Structure formats: C-alpha cells, structure tokens
Coordinates of C-alpha atoms in Angstrom, one line a residue:
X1090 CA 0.0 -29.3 5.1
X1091 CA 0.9 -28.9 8.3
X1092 CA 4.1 -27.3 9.8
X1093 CA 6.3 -26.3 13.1
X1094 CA 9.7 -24.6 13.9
X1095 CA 12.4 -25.9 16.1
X1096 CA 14.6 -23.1 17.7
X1097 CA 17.9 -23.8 19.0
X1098 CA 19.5 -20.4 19.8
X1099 CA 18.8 -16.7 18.8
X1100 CA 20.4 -14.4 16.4
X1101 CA 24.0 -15.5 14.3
X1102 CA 25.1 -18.9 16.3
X1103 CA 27.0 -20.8 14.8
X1104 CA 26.2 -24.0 17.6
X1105 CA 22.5 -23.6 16.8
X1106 CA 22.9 -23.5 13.5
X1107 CA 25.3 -26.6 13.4
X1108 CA 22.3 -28.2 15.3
X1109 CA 19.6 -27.4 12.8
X1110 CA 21.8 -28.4 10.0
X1111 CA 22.8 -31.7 11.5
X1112 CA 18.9 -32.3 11.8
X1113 CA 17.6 -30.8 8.5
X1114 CA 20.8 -33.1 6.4
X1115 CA 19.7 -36.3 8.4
X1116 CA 16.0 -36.1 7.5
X1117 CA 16.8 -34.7 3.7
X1118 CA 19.5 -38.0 3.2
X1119 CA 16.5 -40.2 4.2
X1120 CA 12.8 -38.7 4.4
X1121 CA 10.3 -40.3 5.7
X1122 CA 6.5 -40.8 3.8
X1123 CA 4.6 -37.6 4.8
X1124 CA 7.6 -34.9 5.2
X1125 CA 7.3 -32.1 2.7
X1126 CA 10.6 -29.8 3.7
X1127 CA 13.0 -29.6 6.0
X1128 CA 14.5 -26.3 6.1
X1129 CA 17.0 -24.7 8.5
X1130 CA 17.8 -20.9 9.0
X1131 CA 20.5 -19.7 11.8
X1132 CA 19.3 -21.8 14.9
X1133 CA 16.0 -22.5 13.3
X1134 CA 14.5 -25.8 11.8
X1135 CA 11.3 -25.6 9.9
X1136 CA 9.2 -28.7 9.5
X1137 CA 6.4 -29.5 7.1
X1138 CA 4.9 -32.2 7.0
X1139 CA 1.2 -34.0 5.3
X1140 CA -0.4 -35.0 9.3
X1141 CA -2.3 -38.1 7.3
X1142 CA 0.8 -39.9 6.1
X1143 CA 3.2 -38.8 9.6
X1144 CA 1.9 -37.5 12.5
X1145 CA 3.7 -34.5 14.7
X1146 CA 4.6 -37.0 17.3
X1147 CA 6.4 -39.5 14.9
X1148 CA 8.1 -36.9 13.9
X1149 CA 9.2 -35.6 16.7
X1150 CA 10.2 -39.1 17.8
X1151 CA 12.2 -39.4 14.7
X1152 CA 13.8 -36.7 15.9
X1153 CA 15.7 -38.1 18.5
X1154 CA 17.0 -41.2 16.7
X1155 CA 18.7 -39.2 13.9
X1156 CA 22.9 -38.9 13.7
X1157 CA 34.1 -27.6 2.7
X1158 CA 35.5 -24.3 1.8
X1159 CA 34.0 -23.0 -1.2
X1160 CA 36.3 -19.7 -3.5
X1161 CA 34.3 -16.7 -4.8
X1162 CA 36.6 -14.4 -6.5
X1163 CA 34.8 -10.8 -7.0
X1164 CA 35.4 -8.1 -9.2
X1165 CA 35.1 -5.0 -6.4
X1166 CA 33.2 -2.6 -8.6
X1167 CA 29.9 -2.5 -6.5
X1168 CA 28.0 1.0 -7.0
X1169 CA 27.8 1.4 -3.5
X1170 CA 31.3 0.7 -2.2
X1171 CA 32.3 4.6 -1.9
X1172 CA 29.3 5.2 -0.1
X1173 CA 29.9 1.8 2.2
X1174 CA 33.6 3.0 2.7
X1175 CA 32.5 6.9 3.7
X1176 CA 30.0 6.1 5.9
X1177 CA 32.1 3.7 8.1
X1178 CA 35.5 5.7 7.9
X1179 CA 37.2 3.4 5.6
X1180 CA 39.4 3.7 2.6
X1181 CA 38.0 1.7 -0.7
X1182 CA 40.9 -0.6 0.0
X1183 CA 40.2 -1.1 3.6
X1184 CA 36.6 -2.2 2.7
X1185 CA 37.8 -4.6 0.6
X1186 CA 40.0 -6.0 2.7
X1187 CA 38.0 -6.0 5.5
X1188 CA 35.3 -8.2 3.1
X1189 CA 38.0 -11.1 2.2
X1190 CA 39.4 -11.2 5.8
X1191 CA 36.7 -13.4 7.2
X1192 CA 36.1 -17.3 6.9
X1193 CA 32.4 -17.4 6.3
X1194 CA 29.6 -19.7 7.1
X1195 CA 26.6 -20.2 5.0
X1196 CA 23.9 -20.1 8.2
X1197 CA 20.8 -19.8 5.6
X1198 CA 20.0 -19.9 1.7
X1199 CA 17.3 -19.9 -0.6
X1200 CA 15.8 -16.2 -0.2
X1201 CA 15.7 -16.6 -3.8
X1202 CA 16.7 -20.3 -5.1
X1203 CA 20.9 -20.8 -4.4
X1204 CA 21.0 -17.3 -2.2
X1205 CA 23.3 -17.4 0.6
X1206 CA 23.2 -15.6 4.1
X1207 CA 26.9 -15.9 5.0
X1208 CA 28.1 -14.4 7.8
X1209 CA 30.3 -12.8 9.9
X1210 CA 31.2 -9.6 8.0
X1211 CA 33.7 -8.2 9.8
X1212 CA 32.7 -5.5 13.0
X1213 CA 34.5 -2.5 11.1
X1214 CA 32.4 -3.2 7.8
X1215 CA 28.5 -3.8 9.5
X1216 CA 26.5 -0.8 8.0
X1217 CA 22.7 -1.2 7.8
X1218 CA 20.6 -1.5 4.2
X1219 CA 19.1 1.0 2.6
X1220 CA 16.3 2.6 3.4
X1221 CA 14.4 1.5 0.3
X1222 CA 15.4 -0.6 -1.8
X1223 CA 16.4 -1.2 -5.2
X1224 CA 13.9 -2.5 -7.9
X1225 CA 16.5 -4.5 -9.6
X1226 CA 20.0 -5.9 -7.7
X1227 CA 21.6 -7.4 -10.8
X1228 CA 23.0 -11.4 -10.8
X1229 CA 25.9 -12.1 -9.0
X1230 CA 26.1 -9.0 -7.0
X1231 CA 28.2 -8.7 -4.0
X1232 CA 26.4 -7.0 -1.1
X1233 CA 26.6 -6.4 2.9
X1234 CA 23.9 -5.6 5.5
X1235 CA 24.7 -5.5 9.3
X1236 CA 26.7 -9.0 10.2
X1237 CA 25.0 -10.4 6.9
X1238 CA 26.6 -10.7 3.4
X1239 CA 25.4 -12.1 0.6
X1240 CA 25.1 -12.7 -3.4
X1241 CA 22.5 -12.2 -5.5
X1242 CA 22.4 -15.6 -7.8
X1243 CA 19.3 -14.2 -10.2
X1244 CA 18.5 -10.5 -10.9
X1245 CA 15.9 -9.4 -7.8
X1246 CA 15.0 -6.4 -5.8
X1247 CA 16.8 -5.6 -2.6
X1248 CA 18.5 -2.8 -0.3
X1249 CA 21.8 -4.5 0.9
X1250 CA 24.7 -2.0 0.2
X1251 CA 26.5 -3.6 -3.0
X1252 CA 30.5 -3.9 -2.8
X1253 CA 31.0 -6.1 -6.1
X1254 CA 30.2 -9.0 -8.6
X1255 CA 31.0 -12.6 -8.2
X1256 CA 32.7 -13.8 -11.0
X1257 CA 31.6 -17.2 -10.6
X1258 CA 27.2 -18.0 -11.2
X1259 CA 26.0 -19.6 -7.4
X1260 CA 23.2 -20.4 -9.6
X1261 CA 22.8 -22.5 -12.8
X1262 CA 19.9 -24.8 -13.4
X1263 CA 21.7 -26.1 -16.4
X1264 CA 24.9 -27.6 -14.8
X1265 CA 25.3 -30.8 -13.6
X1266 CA 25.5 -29.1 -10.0
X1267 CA 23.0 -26.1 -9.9
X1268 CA 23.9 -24.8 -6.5
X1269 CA 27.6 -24.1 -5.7
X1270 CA 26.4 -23.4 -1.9
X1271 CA 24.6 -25.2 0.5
X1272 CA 23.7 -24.3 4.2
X1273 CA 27.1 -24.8 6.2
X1274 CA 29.5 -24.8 3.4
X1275 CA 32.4 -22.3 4.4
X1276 CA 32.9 -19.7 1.8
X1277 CA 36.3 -17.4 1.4
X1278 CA 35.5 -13.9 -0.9
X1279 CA 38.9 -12.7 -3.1
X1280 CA 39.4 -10.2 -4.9
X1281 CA 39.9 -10.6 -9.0
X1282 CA 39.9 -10.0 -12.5
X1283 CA 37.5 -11.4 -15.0
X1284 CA 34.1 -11.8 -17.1
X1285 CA 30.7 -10.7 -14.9
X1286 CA 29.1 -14.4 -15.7
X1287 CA 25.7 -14.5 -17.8
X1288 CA 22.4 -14.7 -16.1
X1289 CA 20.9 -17.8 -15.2
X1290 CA 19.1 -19.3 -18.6
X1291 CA 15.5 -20.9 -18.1
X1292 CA 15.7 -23.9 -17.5
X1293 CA 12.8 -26.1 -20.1
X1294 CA 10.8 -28.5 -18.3
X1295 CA 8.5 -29.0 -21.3
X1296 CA 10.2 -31.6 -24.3
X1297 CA 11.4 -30.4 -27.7
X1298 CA 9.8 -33.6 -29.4
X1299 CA 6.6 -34.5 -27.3
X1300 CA 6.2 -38.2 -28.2
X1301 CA 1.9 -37.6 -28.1
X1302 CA 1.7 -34.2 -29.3
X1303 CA -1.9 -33.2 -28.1
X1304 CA -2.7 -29.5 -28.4
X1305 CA -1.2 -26.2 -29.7
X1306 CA -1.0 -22.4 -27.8
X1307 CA -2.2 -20.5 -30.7
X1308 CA -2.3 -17.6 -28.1
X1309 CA -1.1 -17.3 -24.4
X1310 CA -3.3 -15.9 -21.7
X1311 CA -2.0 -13.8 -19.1
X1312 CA 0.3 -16.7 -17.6
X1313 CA -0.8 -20.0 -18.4
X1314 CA 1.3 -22.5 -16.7
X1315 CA 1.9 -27.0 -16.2
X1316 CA 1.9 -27.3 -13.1
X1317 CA 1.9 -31.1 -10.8
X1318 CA 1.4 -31.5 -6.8
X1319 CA 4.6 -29.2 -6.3
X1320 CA 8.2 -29.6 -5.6
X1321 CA 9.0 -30.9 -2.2
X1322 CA 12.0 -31.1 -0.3
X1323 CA 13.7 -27.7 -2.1
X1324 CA 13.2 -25.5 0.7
X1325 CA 16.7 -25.6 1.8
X1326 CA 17.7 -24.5 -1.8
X1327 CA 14.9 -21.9 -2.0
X1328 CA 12.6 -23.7 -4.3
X1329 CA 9.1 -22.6 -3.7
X1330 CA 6.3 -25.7 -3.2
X1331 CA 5.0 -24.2 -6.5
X1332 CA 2.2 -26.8 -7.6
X1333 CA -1.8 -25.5 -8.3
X1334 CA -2.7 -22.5 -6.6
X1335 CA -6.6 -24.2 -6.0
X1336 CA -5.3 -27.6 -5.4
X1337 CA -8.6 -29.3 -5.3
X1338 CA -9.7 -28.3 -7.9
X1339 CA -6.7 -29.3 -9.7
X1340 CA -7.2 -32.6 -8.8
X1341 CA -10.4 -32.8 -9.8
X1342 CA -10.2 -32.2 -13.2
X1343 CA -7.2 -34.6 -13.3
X1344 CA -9.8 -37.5 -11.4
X1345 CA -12.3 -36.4 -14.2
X1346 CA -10.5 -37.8 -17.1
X1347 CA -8.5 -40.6 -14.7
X1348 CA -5.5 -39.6 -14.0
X1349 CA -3.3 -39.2 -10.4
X1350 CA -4.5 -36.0 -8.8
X1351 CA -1.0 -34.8 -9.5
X1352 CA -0.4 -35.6 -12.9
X1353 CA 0.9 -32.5 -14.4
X1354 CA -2.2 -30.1 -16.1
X1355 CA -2.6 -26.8 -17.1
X1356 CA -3.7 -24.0 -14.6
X1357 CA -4.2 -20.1 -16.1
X1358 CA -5.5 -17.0 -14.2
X1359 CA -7.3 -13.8 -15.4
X1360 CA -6.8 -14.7 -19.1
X1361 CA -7.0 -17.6 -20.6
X1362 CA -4.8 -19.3 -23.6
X1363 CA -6.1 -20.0 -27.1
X1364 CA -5.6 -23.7 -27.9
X1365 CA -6.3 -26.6 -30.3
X1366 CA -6.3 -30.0 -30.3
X1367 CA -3.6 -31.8 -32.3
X1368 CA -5.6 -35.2 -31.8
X1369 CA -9.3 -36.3 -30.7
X1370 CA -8.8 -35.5 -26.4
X1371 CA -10.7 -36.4 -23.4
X1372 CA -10.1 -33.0 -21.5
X1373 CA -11.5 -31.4 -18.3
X1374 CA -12.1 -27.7 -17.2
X1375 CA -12.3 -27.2 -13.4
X1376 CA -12.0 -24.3 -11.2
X1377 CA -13.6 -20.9 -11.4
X1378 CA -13.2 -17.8 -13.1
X1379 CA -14.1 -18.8 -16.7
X1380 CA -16.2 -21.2 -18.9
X1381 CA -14.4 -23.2 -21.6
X1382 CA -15.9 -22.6 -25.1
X1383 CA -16.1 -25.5 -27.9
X1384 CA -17.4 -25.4 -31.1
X1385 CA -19.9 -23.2 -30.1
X1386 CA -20.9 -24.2 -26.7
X1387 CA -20.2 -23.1 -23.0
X1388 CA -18.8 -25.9 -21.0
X1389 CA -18.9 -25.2 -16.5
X1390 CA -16.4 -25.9 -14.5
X1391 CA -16.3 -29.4 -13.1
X1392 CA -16.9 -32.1 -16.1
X1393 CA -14.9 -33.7 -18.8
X1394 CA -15.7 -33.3 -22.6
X1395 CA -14.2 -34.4 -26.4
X1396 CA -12.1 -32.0 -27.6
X1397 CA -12.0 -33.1 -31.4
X1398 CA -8.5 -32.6 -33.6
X1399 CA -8.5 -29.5 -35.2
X1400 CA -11.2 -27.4 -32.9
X1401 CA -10.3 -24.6 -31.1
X1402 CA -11.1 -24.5 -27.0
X1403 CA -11.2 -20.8 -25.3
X1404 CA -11.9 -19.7 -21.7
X1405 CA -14.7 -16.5 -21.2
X1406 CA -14.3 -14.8 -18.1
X1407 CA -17.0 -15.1 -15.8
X1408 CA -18.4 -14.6 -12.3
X1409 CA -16.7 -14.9 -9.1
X1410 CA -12.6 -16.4 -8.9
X1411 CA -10.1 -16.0 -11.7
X1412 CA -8.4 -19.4 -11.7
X1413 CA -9.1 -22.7 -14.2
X1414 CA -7.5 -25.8 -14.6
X1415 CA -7.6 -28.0 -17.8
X1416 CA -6.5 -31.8 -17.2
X1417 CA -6.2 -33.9 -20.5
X1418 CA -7.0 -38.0 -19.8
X1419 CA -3.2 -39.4 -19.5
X1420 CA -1.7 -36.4 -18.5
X1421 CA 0.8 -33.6 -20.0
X1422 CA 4.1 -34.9 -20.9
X1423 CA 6.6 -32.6 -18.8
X1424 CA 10.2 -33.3 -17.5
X1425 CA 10.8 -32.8 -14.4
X1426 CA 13.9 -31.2 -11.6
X1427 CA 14.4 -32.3 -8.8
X1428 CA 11.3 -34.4 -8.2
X1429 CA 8.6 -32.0 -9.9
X1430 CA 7.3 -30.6 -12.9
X1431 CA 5.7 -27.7 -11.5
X1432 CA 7.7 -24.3 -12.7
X1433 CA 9.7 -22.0 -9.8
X1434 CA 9.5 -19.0 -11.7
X1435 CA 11.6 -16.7 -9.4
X1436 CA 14.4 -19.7 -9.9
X1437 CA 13.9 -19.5 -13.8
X1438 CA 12.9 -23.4 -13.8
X1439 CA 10.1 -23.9 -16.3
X1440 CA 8.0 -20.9 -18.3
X1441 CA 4.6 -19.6 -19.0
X1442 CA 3.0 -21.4 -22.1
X1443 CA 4.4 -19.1 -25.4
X1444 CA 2.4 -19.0 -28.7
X1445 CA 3.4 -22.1 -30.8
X1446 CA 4.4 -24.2 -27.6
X1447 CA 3.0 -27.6 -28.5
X1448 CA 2.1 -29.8 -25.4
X1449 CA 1.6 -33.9 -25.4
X1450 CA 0.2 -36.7 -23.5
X1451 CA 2.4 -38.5 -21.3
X1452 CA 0.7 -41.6 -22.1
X1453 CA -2.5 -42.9 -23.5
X1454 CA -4.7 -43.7 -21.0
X1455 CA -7.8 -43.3 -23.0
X1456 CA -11.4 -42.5 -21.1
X1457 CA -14.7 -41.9 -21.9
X1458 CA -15.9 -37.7 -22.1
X1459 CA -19.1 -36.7 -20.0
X1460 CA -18.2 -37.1 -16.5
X1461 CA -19.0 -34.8 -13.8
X1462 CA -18.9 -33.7 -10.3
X1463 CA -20.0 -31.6 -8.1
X1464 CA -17.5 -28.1 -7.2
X1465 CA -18.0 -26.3 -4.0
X1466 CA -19.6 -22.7 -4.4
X1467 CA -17.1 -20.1 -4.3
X1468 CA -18.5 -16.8 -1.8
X1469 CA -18.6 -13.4 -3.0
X1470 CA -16.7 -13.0 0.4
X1471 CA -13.8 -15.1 2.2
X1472 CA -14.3 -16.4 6.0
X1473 CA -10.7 -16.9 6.8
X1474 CA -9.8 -19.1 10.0
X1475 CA -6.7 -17.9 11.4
X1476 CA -4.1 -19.5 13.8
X1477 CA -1.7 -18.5 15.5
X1478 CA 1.7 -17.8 13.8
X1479 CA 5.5 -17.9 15.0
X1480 CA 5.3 -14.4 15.9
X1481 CA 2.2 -14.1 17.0
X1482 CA 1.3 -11.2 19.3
X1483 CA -2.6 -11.1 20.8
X1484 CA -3.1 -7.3 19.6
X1485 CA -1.8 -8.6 15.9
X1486 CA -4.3 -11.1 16.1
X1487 CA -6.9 -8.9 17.7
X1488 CA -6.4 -6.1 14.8
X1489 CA -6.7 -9.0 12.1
X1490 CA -10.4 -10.3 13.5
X1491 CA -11.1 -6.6 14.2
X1492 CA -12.9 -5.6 10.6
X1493 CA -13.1 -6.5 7.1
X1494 CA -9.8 -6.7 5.1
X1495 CA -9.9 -6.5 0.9
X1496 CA -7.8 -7.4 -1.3
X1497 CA -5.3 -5.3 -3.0
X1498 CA -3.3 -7.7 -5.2
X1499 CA -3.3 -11.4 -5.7
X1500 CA -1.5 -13.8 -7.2
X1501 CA 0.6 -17.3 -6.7
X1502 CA 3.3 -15.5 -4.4
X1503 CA 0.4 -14.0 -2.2
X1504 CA -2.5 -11.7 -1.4
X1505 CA -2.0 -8.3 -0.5
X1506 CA -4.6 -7.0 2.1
X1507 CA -6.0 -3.7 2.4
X1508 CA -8.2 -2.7 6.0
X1509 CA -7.1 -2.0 9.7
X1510 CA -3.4 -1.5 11.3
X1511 CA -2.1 -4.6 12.1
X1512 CA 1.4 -4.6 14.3
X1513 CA 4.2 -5.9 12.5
X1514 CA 7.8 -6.4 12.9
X1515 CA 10.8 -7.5 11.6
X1516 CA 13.9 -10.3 12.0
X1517 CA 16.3 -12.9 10.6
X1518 CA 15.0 -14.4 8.0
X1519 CA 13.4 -17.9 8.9
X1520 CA 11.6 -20.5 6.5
X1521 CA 8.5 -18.8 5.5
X1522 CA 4.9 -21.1 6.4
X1523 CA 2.0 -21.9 3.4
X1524 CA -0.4 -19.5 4.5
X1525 CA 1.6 -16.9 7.0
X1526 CA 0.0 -13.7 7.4
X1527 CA 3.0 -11.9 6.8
X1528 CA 3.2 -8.2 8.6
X1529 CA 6.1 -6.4 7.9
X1530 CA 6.7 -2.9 10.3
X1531 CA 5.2 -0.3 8.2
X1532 CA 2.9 -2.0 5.5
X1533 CA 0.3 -4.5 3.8
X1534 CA -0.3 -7.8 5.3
X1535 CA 0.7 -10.3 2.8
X1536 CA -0.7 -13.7 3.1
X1537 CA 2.1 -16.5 1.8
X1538 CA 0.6 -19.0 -0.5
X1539 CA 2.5 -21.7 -3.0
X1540 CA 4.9 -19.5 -4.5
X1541 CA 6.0 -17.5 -2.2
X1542 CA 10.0 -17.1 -1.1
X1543 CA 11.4 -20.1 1.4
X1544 CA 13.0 -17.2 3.8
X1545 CA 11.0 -13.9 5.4
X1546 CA 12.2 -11.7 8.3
X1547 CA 8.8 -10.1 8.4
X1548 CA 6.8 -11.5 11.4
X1549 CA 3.5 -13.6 10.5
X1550 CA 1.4 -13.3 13.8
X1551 CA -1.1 -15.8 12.3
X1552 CA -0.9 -18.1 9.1
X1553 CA -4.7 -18.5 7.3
X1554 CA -6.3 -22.5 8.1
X1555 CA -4.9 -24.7 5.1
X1556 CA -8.4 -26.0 4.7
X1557 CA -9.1 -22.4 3.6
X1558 CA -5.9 -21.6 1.4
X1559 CA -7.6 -22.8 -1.5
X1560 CA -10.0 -19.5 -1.5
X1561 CA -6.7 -17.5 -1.9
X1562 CA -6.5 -19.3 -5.0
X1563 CA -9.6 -17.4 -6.6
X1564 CA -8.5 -14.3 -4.9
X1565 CA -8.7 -11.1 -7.4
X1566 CA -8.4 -7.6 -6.7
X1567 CA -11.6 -6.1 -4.4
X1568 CA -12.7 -9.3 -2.5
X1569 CA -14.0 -8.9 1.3
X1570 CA -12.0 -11.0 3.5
X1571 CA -13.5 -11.5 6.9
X1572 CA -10.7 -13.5 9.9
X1573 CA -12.3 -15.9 12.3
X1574 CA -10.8 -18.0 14.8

C-alpha cells in the first residue's frame, strides 16, 4: 500500500472541497485496477493505491481526464446546551435558533463510519470542545465545536459541546441505504418532537445455515475474528481497511491448504478460541504467538494438518508475537458488505466469534494435509523504517530516530509508544494513512494500522515503511521499537 494527499485549499472552503469531491466521486463511480480509497476531507483528497497494479504516475494522469438537501429534525435536550448558551451570551432559544439557521455542507465523514463534519455553524454559536472529553457521546447526538457540527451515528468518545439528539439514525447497516449522508450532501437541522431512535444493531456477516458446517467455538478467545484482504473503497464512509493485521501470514496459511490469499480465515490475538471439527478438515496455523494443539500434539506455525471430525484444536501461548491465523482448505463461508467480509467493529459490521457460533466451508476444494513453508523469524525487537509523513517536521522526525520507543498498548486500531518527546500538533481532520505515526500535542505517539479511524486531526510527521507494518501485527505490550530511515 502506497498513498498521497492532494490539497486544494486550507481550512473550511467550500471551492476546495467541491474540487476534492468532484475528484474522489469520479474515481469511486469507476475505479481503476490498483486503487484502494479515495477519500476526500475539506480541500483534501487522499489516495491509496497497490504501486504493482497502478503506478503514481497513471494515477496522476488519470487525474486529469476525469469529469440534495437532506432534513434532521432534533430533539434540543443536549446536556450541554445551558452551558453552550451561558458561555456565549445566548438565551437557550437563541442557541437553538442560531443551530437551524444555517444551510450546511457535509465537507467530511467517516470519523466513525456515516459521521458527518457539516459546517458552517453560525459565528454567534462557535465555542471550542471540551477540554477532555467524554468516554461515551451517546448515538445520535447533536454536538458543536468551533465552525464544526456534527452527529454522533454509533455511541463513541468525544468533547464536542452537545446541543441535542437526532431523531432520525445517520447510521443503519441494516437498511437498504445505511448512510443517510454522504460528503457534499446539504443538510438543514429542525427542531422537533419524537422517539430518540435505537442504536445501530450488528450487522451479521456470518450465515444462519452454513451450507458446509465445518467447525464449532466451544469457547472464544480474547477476540477471535473472520477476517479477508479488507474492505476497500469505504474510506469516504468511514469503513476502516479492516482485513489481517499480519497479512502475510494470513496468506500463507490460506496458500497452505490452496486457497486465494484473501479467502476469508480466522485470525485471534492473545487468547485463542476452543474449536472442533464438525467434519474431517485440511486446516492451517500460521503466524506467531501460539502453537495449535491436536490430539495430543504441538503443531508450529507455518504447515497444514488433518483436523479429524469430532477432535478438539487449541492454541498455547508461546514465545515472541501474539497473533495466529487458522485457514481451512476451501475457505470460511462469510457474507459480505460492501465488497468484504472482513468485520469494522467500530461500525458494528460483523462480531467476534461467540461460544456456539458454527462456521462452514465456502466450498469444497479438498487438499492434501502436510504442507509447509518456511515463516520469517520474528525479533525480540522491531527496526522500524520511517518516512516522512504529511506533517512532517525535521525535529519530529529527529526525536522519533533519537532513542528506543516501547510499546504501551497494541492492538488492530494501533500501537501506543512509550520513549522520548516527540512534537506534535493538531488540525482538521484529514484521511488518516496505514502506518502514520500519529502525534497528537500533548501525548503517546500512536502508530495507525488496519483498523484504525478514516479521519485524524492529529499530525503524523512520519508513517512506519509498509514492508514493516506487519511487525505491528505481533506487537504486545513491552516490545523495544528502534526508528531508522
């Protein structure tokens, strides 16, 4: 993966974002082999794109041959709209009005999947967030920061001031049309009586009545999920690229027992699930983290084995890296949205595996058990190459190379550094990049990985080589992590 940002104009412009849009819509109604997203933000355009299928150039070449008022009524009952109304002079009333007055424009969405940036708000009613913010907004509220206003589709954390609750669901995986808004719609706030609408449901990628039921969760591990490549093209929405977090070896368990590197397998981290076979399986354990355990004996990472109907397959923990794979010969049967299988958690498409969940094979595509191939040693301690980012700043990258970093916490959204002072900052939200070293004003460097949001206003200075993202994969609390150019 490789990616770059076209900038048309700074700040809330409504000509630069009309520019980015135009671009982004043309490329999303017909992409060509090798984009990945296409994601605009204000005056910004973020590409990404796979460099051995379309080339920069091409791209950019591309480029230059390319070419709706929307109601929210809201219930003004927001906890913070006496504070909002004292702190700028206004009556309740006033605020209120001063909210509906304006025509909106959605310049960005997707912080989390169907979130809309709209703006202008009004001069009268700009009032910065909070200081710190919330641990929990709740769905559908109505809230205000600076120019900025926006609604909260899914329950999330946040710090912009909250003046109500829509009484209509921006978000709804289940409808025939998920996402009310999209980037440019206009949008027109009212004020109104009714229901607070229910929270997104989880949407189930994983069928009811698997036609080849092949194994059984007797127990879950710590959060075991099917993933395939990833979801491309969802950006815009704010669907995370999702997918395996150690994509190769993802696909090499799948090439162990034949199938498309992307055909949709099991990945788990920290803990493993419980499971048993339903039906005699060709499976395959890859990764690191664990060794599988079958009737008795310890399978390594990196070969495919018979897993017999009726016998039971566990994961120990062991040695370096937390995260395994398991690939079954044909594949897991898993429905997809919007091009993918692969879950988007913070969008509340797909689940962790549950106790009872019974998975099948998409088709039988029978192969014999035994192979093997070699997996590349995972270090005690990470070399990261670093390159420059979209905000880079020579002292950021100086600080970053400076001394060892550790990690604090890790998972699929990112890894959480501990070590020197890096400089940071702080902006409109633009698409975030696979691998950004994100460095917010005042603390931890957070570097971005598959499931991380599709917007960020913190700066990343540098983003981590993509050849090297797959070490982030296996990252666990404690690891040394050493930046090199």
């Amino acid at each position: 993966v490789r990616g770059f940002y076209l900038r048309f104009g700074e700040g809330v412009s409504e000509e630069a974002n009309r520019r980015a849009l135009a671009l982004a819509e043309a490329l999303l109604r017909a992409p060509p082999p090798g984009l990945l997203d296409a994601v605009p933000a204000y005056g910004v355009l973020y590409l990404e794109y796979d460099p051995r299928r379309l080339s920069r150039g091409r791209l950019l070449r591309l480029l230059k041959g390319l070419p709706r008022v929307v109601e929210i009524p809201v219930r003004y009952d927001g906890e913070d709209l006496p504070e909002v109304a004292s702190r700028l002079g206004l009556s309740l009333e006033a605020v209120k009005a001063l909210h509906q007055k304006p025509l909106y424009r959605v310049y960005a969405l997707g912080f989390t999947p169907g979130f809309p940036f709209l703006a202008e708000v009004e001069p009268a009613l700009r009032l910065p967030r909070k200081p710190h913010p919330r641990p929990r907004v709740p769905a559908h509220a109505v809230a205000v920061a600076g120019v900025q206003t926006g609604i909260y589709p899914l329950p999330s954390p946040g710090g912009w001031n909250l003046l109500g609750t829509s009484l209509v669901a921006v978000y709804d995986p289940h409808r025939e049309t998920p996402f009310l808004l999209r980037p440019g719609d206009r949008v027109r706030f009212l004020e109104a009586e009714g229901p607070t609408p229910p929270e997104p449901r989880p949407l189930e990628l994983l069928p009811e009545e698997p036609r080849l039921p092949a194994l059984l969760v007797e127990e879950p591990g710590l959060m075991d999920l099917v993933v395939d490549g990833g979801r491309f093209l969802g950006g815009h929405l704010g669907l995370a690229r999702s997918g395996p977090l150690d994509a190769p070896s993802a696909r090499l368990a799948n090439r162990l027992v034949g199938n498309g590197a992307g055909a949709p397998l099991l990945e788990f981290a920290y803990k493993g699930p419980v499971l048993t076979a339903l039906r005699d399986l060709v499976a395959a354990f890859a990764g690191y983290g664990f060794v599988a355990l079958l009737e008795g004996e310890e399978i390594p990472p990196g070969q495919s084995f018979l897993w017999p109907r009726g016998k039971t397959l566990r994961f120990r923990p062991r040695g370096p890296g937390v995260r395994g794979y398991l690939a079954v010969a044909g594949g897991l049967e898993v429905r997809p949205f919007l091009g993918s299988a692969s879950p988007d958690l913070r969008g509340r498409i797909g689940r962790p595996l549950w106790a009872g969940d019974v998975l099948g094979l998409e088709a039988l595509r029978p192969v014999r058990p035994g192979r093997a191939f070699p997996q590349r040693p995972l270090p005690e301690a990470f070399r990261l190459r670093l390159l420059p980012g979209p905000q880079f700043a020579g002292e950021a990258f100086r600080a970053l190379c400076s001394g060892p970093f550790r990690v604090a916490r890790a998972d699929r959204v990112g890894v959480e550094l501990l070590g020197p002072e890096v400089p940071g900052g702080e902006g409109l939200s633009e698409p975030t990049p696979l691998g950004g070293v994100q460095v917010p004003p005042s603390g931890r460097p957070l570097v971005l990985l598959a499931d991380k949001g599709s917007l960020g206003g913190y700066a990343k200075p540098a983003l981590v080589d993509p050849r090297d993202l797959w070490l982030l994969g296996q990252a666990r609390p404690g690891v040394e992590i050493h930046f090199t150019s």
